[PDB]
Ligand binder design. Structure first.
Ligand SMILES: CC(=O)c1nc(NC(=O)[C@H]2CNCCN2)sc1-c1ccc(C(=O)N2CCOCC2)cc1
Length: 130
């Protein structure tokens, strides 16, 4: 309905604002764009489902997220992918892992403080009705 599309537009505005705040954080610069194949050709090999904050923005604008749960699944994928690609005890690996967990924790904390649970419930009930 027209009212339901108003609800999803509000969700998109909220998700763009959260993603923008993550993308401007210097800690998260490594997650802002897709991995360049000419710089790292072996990334495409190990990581089967690449995700980054620019691609999240693209999916918001393509209306792919109907709930905050669907959005947080892609945030979680950014984090899990980084841990997968960086399993060594080496400090370069440990730094990326720390930043990836901070990205995940920051997104969840913003959502916990700023998303009304009733708004998310409405989004989920509209989604389940389709
Ligand atoms: C994103 C990610 O997970 C990742 N992990 C790395 N791991 C290392 O550098 C470790 C690997 N294990 C050995 C020590 N170094 S490097 C790395 C990584 C860092 C930068 C890019 C990159 O080209 N861009 C392009 C635009 O800006 C955003 C990121 C891709 C992968």
């Amino acid at each position: 309905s027209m009212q339901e599309e108003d609800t999803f537009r509000e969700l998109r505005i909220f998700l763009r604002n959260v993603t923008h705040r993550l993308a401007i954080d210097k800690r998260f610069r490594v997650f802002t764009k897709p991995v360049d194949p000419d710089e790292v050709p072996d990334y495409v090999t190990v990581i089967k489902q690449p995700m980054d904050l620019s691609s999240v923005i693209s999916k918001i604008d393509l209306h792919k997220y109907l709930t905050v749960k669907d959005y947080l699944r892609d945030i979680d994928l950014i984090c899990s992918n980084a841990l997968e690609y960086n399993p060594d005890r080496d400090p370069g690996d440990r730094l990326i892992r720390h930043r990836a967990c901070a990205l995940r924790d920051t997104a969840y904390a913003i959502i916990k403080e700023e998303l009304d649970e009733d708004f998310e419930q409405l989004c989920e009930e509209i989604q389940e009705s389709r």
